[PDB]
Amino acid sequence: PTTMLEERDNLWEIGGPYWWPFSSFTPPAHLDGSLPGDRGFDPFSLGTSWGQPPVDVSDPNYDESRLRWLLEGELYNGRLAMLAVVGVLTVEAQGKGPWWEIPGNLNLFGTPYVVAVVGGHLAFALLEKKRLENFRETGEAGHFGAARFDPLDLTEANPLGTDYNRQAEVRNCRLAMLTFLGFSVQAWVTGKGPIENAKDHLASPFEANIFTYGDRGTNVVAIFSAFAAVMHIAELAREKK
Amino acid sequence: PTTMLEERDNLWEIGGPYWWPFSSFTPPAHLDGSLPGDRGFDPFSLGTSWGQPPVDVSDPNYDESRLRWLLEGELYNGRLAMLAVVGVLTVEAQGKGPWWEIPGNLNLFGTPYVVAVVGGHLAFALLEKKRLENFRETGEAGHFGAARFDPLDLTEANPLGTDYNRQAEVRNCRLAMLTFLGFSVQAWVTGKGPIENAKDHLASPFEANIFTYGDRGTNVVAIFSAFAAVMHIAELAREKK
Ligand code: CLA
Ligand code: CLA
Ligand code: CLA
Ligand code: CLA
Ligand code: CLA
Ligand code: CLA
Ligand code: CLA
Ligand SMILES: CC1=C[C@@H](O)CC(C)(C)[C@H]1/C=C/C(C)=C/C=C/C(C)=C/C=C/C=C(C)/C=C/C=C(/C=C/C1=C(C)C[C@H](O)CC1(C)C)CO
């Protein structure tokens, strides 16, 4: 595949070339630097379980095919979030009201709904069939009728390195996913929009924060703090095998 | 590097050439006199953990590179505090009000804020890239476009010794850091300014002290006394391996 790296390197980010930037840390055995965006992040070992790739079973190098399937899933989920962020910023910040009420103001019912759903699913099923059918011969799955989709050959055309685009794409998509999670959770606690929250925070950043919106802003903090205290205990327990 | 010493010596200060000036004290194994400002101060052994230097991994002398990275961090943090102390004394003691309200009286909002932030970050990212890129070939990181930055060669031009400037710089920076911590905590308990506290203490030094400002002056003393009683018990426990 061309979705895998060519140099097997770890980039030096905020603290080190690994999350958890202390000296008592050994990266997980199945993460060795072969895929873009590697940092050894796996507190719950979901890379050795959690999925079944569409490959012939009992073929050697099957445990690696599962990480490639999960990477395909990660890229696919990020490529939609990067489009959704642009599509919500270019609408909510141009003329329109809350972005979470636009679909409910189309008045789609009866026959048009049915024909739209059926046609969209026909197209997506035809594309998905080809994706599944591509992954199985070559360990890669391009979305638009081709296994690789490089209409303009730019996968190695960046003047700062060979495998630079591959590392940039998996990181922009990774940032956009939790960007959109932020939009979805912000719209439910504050009631305002994205820009209307940034400006409120920049105006006076000591009452226009999360801790001043009532019970929801406390419930989210509680959930976040409880989930963040479990994946660190899990990592500490993992380091003792 | 030229940030390390040439003579491997310990200077004799307030009590001895070590903190904890008693006879039952052996310096930590990783602190041996090779860096400026050495005193064997390490109750919590943060010099063998806590960080990952940007060097090629598995290269010999990796445990020493981490102390050099932490020394780089110490010098970097001190060089900003020494500028901030001068910048707050030359403003608060010249004409202006509380120094912790100046940024809030610039009225920076909208486009100017965004362009200023983006430009500053562009410049700092360009400089930081060069710093990270310098540390990795030579174990040193100068901030201003050069690995060493000696426009006027004065690193060995002091008429009291060879490595005198190196020991003076790490100590002035070390004093300025807790100087500024004092300014920040003083402004929150007293409400006055820096000079307005020194003059109040010199006027009548038995009611213009920390113990007479209410509950905050007691909370700070309590926190200080609780943190000071933990790093001595830790040192005593360390001395018994
Ligand atoms: C409350 C829980 C919690 C906390 C406190 C942290 C804290 C941290 N995480 Mg995170 N993390 C958490 C939950 C949490 N994590 C969860 C739930 C997940 C699952 C998704 C992760 C997954 C995760 C990963 C995968 C990584 C981290 C990393 C980090 C570090 C960088 C954070 C960062 O970029 O800040 C944002 C900060 C900035 C963009 C710049 C900071 C500058 C600000 C604006 C002010 C100046 C800086 C500051 C003053 C300097 C120190 C001063 C201070 C000591 C007084 C940091 C120690 C990274 C790390 O440690 O890499 C080595 C990392 O790779 N975390
Ligand atoms: C759905 C998106 C998705 C998927 C499929 C993956 C998949 C992968 N990531 Mg992860 N990752 C993602 C999003 C995703 N990532 C995001 C958004 C971040 C930013 C925090 C990261 C950051 C990250 C790092 C730093 C690293 C990986 C790595 C990996 C690989 C490790 C194996 C693994 O855990 O796979 C299984 C993963 C799943 C099956 C997804 C499980 C989703 C859970 C169950 C839902 C949790 C939802 C909850 C609301 C989260 C709240 C977070 C918020 C509070 C902060 C794998 C290819 C490692 C690697 O080597 O990559 C090449 C690696 O070093 N990822
Ligand atoms: C997947 C994300 C997503 C989703 C679900 C929607 C959904 C919607 N958008 Mg769209 N939109 C998106 C992304 C998205 N948008 C993007 C990326 C942009 C920036 C160009 C916009 C800009 C935009 C505007 C300006 C408006 C909408 C509006 C709408 C609504 C009516 C449909 C319409 O007029 O579309 C029009 C959308 C477009 C002309 C751009 C579509 C871009 C597609 C989805 C990106 C993917 C293209 C694909 C990969 C190309 C394949 C090429 C290959 C075969 C070679 C609808 C709820 C209208 C609205 O808000 O009504 C109230 C409206 O005025 N959108
Ligand atoms: C993706 C990045 C992102 C950004 C830039 C912001 C920005 C903001 N959020 Mg947060 N937010 C995010 C994700 C993000 N959010 C996520 C993932 C969640 C779900 C847990 C929320 C849920 C949330 C709520 C419920 C509220 C905010 C609010 C705010 C504002 C005040 C800060 C605060 O209270 O943070 C709180 C942050 C958290 C609870 C969790 C940390 C969020 C991520 C993981 C930190 C990422 C750090 C990273 C270095 C930032 C990059 C910035 C980017 C420009 C490069 C501010 C505009 C408040 C607001 O609107 O005030 C007006 C508010 O009420 N956010
Ligand atoms: C409440 C807790 C506490 C106390 C009582 C002390 C006490 C001491 N520390 Mg400190 N220390 C503490 C917490 C504390 N430390 C903490 C939290 C840290 C972490 C940052 C350290 C880290 C630390 C280090 C790294 C070092 C010390 C050192 C010292 C000694 C010198 C202090 C000094 O310069 O005073 C200031 C005094 C003067 C500048 C001059 C004194 C003159 C005054 C004005 C009056 C006259 C002197 C006096 C009357 C003479 C004795 C008389 C008396 C017996 C009646 C002293 C025994 C040093 C040491 O022992 O070196 C051998 C040393 O190197 N400490
Ligand atoms: C951020 C600044 C900073 C940093 C990075 C370092 C780094 C270092 N110092 Mg330390 N040092 C500092 C400030 C700093 N120092 C200050 C301000 C003082 C004066 C009290 C000293 C005094 C001192 C001595 C006397 C010695 C060192 C030495 C060392 C080395 C020991 C290894 C170590 O612990 O590193 C790791 C350190 C860190 C990761 C910083 C941790 C910061 C903690 C977690 C925060 C505590 C904040 C809290 C509010 C403090 C309140 C104090 C107040 C109540 C008095 C290392 C290079 C030894 C050496 O050989 O130097 C060459 C040595 O002998 N330092
Ligand atoms: C890092 C510390 C720091 C910070 C954050 C600030 C911040 C500020 N200062 Mg400045 N200031 C500083 C240090 C600092 N100062 C120093 C060191 C001095 C002594 C010369 C002053 C003296 C000073 C005065 C007299 C005034 C301010 C004022 C201000 C405010 C408006 C900006 C301005 O007019 O700057 C003007 C600042 C300068 C002309 C001096 C800047 C010195 C820089 C920061 C030192 C570093 C230089 C750099 C290393 C050189 C690189 C060379 C290399 C390429 C070869 C602003 C909040 C104004 C104010 O209070 O308005 C209400 C104001 O009147 N400052
Ligand atoms: C927890 C854990 C354990 C470890 O072992 C490893 C690990 C990495 C798994 C780790 C963490 C995993 C994490 C944090 C994963 C997070 C995944 C996340 C947050 C994924 C988010 C995906 C979001 C997506 C697709 C969003 C799609 C949004 C769309 C929106 C569509 C819109 C709608 C509805 C109408 C609007 O008018 C217009 C528009 C906004 C476009 C649709 O266009």
Numbering used by the authors:
A (entry chain B), B (entry chain A): 51 to 291
Sentences from the paper on this structure:
Since only far-red light is available at a deep layer of the colony, P. crispa has evolved a molecular system for photosystem II (PSII) excitation using far-red light with uphill energy transfer. Here, we purified a light-harvesting chlorophyll (Chl)-binding protein complex from P. crispa (Pc-frLHC) that excites PSII with far-red light and revealed its ring-shaped structure with undecameric 11-fold symmetry at 3.13 Å resolution. The circular arrangement of the Pc-frLHC subunits is unique among eukaryote LHCs and forms unprecedented Chl pentamers at every subunit‒subunit interface near the excitation energy exit sites.
Pc-frLHC is an undecamer with 11-fold symmetry. Pc-frLHC is the first example of a ring-shaped eukaryotic LHC. We found 11 Chls and two carotenoids in the subunit of Pc-frLHC. We, therefore, modeled the 11 Chls as Chl a. Instead, Pc-frLHC has His171, and this His residue coordinates directly the Mg2+ of Chl708.
